[PDB]
């Protein structure tokens, strides 16, 4: 929070940049803290936290063009343009946070106004009582009823972060909207760790 909040006053002190880089490229996991910057109070720290989160999670993907976009309500969006160096070889993506659950569906069509090459990450503040079954049911309802991921522009996968972090991944393209493999794991690390070499096994994390 020191790094993420001291950069905010006037970004570009020529040491804050390096400190953000350290948060990206340090050994210590900060994924137990980064989802707490839903807004926090500044509303600019959203931008910084999303940058660090995506850049640390998407270490393996080669990022080239990141940009911060705003709406005049509660919707910090960030778009990312990267490529795949050596794995199924140019995708695009983005990330946005919400509150409780219904704020997601409320402006779901607005946040999408940025081949299904798009990837969307969604982070939802529900800081109470891990209930994985209920969470999964709630997400399945949206992904089974609403097919904006196919008809708007094409999103390959939709990943929900529940706030330590509890990831739930849903692909509304070909298979049933569920993923038992990457439960509690962000599938951005699917190339960092060679999980495709396990077709012959049934795995439990």
């Amino acid at each position: 929070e020191s790094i993420f909040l001291s950069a905010i006053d006037m970004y570009g002190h020529q040491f804050c940049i390096e400190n953000l880089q350290k948060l990206i490229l340090s050994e210590t996991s900060i994924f137990d803290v980064l989802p707490n910057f839903f807004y926090h109070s500044n509303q600019v720290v959203r931008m910084a936290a999303l940058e660090v989160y995506v850049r640390r999670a998407y270490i393996a993907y080669e990022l080239n063009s990141v940009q911060h976009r705003q709406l005049k309500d509660n919707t910090c969006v960030v778009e990312f343009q990267f490529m795949l160096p050596t794995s199924h070889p140019q995708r695009m993506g983005g990330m946005v946070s919400f509150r409780t659950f219904e704020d997601f569906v409320r402006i779901f069509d607005e946040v999408m106004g940025c081949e299904p090459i798009h990837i969307l990450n969604v982070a939802i503040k529900t800081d109470c009582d891990i209930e994985d079954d209920r969470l999964a049911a709630m997400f399945r309802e949206f992904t089974q009823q609403n097919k904006a991921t196919l008809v708007d522009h094409g999103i390959r996968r939709l990943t929900f972060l529940v706030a330590f972090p509890k990831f739930f991944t849903f692909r509304a393209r070909d298979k049933f909207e569920e993923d038992r493999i990457y439960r509690h794991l962000e599938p951005a690390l699917a190339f960092q760790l060679e999980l495709n070499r396990m077709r012959n096994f049934d795995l439990t994390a």
Binding site: G12, C16, L20, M47, N64, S65, V66, H68, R69, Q81
Partner: peptide, 13 residues
């Protein structure tokens, strides 16, 4: 062009 693509980012220099 790259610089333009990174506008509105804390790492934009």
């Amino acid at each position: 062009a790259q610089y333009a693509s990174n506008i509105t980012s804390v790492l934009c220099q």
